[PDB]
Amino acid sequence: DSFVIRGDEVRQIAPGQTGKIADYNYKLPDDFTGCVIAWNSNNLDSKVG
């Protein structure tokens, strides 16, 4: 599952988390098995305007 989120919202990509991303955008189950991999993409996904 691939997407782009804010830098301080990577805390919410975990089982049992609360926030706008966990509750309204992407919910992980409490029994989740797998790996959450994230990295900064400021040079790719940011424009000057």
Binding site: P15, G16, T18, D30
Partner: protein, 49 residues
């Protein structure tokens, strides 16, 4: 104290039942002894614990 042998058995059974009742009021290290308080105050990841 003529019938103390039967009364001892009755008192032991009633006291064991009373102790088994009173063990429900102990939290055993949890935040509360009531399941409804835990299920209403906490999310399921910590309410499970």
């Amino acid at each position: 104290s003529a019938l103390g042998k039967l009364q001892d058995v009755v008192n032991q059974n009633a006291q064991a039942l009373n102790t088994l009742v009173k063990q429900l009021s102990s939290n055993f290290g949890a935040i509360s002894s009531v399941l409804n308080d835990i299920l209403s105050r906490l999310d399921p990841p910590e309410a499970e614990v």
